[PDB]
Design an enzyme around this catalytic site. Structure first.
Site, mmCIF file in Angstrom:
data_model
loop_
_atom_site.group_PDB
_atom_site.id
_atom_site.type_symbol
_atom_site.label_atom_id
_atom_site.label_comp_id
_atom_site.label_asym_id
_atom_site.label_seq_id
_atom_site.Cartn_x
_atom_site.Cartn_y
_atom_site.Cartn_z
ATOM 1 C CD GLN A 113 -2.807 -1.302 2.463
ATOM 2 O OE1 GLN A 113 -3.860 -0.571 2.472
ATOM 3 N NE2 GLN A 113 -2.609 -2.284 3.187
ATOM 4 C CB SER A 136 -3.860 -2.793 6.832
ATOM 5 O OG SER A 136 -3.677 -3.078 5.499
ATOM 6 C CG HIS A 139 1.452 -0.492 8.718
ATOM 7 N ND1 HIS A 139 1.171 -1.564 8.574
ATOM 8 C CD2 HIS A 139 0.539 0.208 8.235
ATOM 9 C CE1 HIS A 139 0.223 -1.787 7.807
ATOM 10 N NE2 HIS A 139 -0.393 -0.491 7.471
#
Ligand SMILES: *S(=O)(=O)c1ccc(C(=O)O)cc1
EC number: 5.2.1.8
Length: 145
Positions: A113, A136, A139
């Site tokens: 991504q 998602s 991160h």
């Protein structure tokens, strides 16, 4: 300054520091592209993640703001040395890569991504991202190669 660094002022102390708006890293020192890089990451999902489910938790209910606070705590303990990145990824990452200490193997552009890709390729070897947002979740990215 290397790709995407700017000079800012600490709000709490008034000392200057350096911030990278691609990786969301910040550091006190003046900052020190390849076809491929290798990264690990620690993913914290939230109710708005594309798939709000993980090996750790069938129904992920935490808010994006709660996820960001968890990420911020992990970054703190990683930076202080109280915890290892690998240990926190293993215990707490909402990604199947948790079993590999967050290791994702090597990759080139065009696979991940986009915000993740940009951060990965703007990190230096050994360097860690700030919170990085994707569909998602949130991160922490560690560039290992
Ligand atoms: S700084 O001004 O570079 C800076 C301020 C606030 C954050 C944040 O994560 O809230 C990062 C950098």
């Amino acid at each position: 300054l290397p790709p995407g660094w700017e000079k800012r002022m600490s709000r709490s102390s008034g000392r200057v520091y350096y911030f990278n708006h691609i990786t969301n890293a910040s550091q006190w020192e003046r900052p020190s592209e390849p076809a491929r890089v290798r990264c690990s990451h620690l993913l914290v999902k939230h109710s708005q993640s594309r798939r709000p489910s993980s090996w750790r938790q069938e129904k992920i209910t935490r808010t994006k703001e709660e996820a960001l606070e968890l990420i911020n705590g992990y970054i703190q303990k990683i930076k202080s040395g109280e915890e290892d990145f690998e240990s926190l990824a293993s215990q707490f990452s909402d990604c199947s890569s948790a079993k590999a200490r967050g290791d994702l193997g090597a990759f080139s552009r065009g696979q991940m991504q986009k915000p993740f890709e940009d951060a990965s390729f703007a990190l230096r070897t050994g360097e860690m991202s700030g919170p990085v947002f994707t569909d998602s979740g949130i991160h922490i990215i560690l560039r290992t190669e």
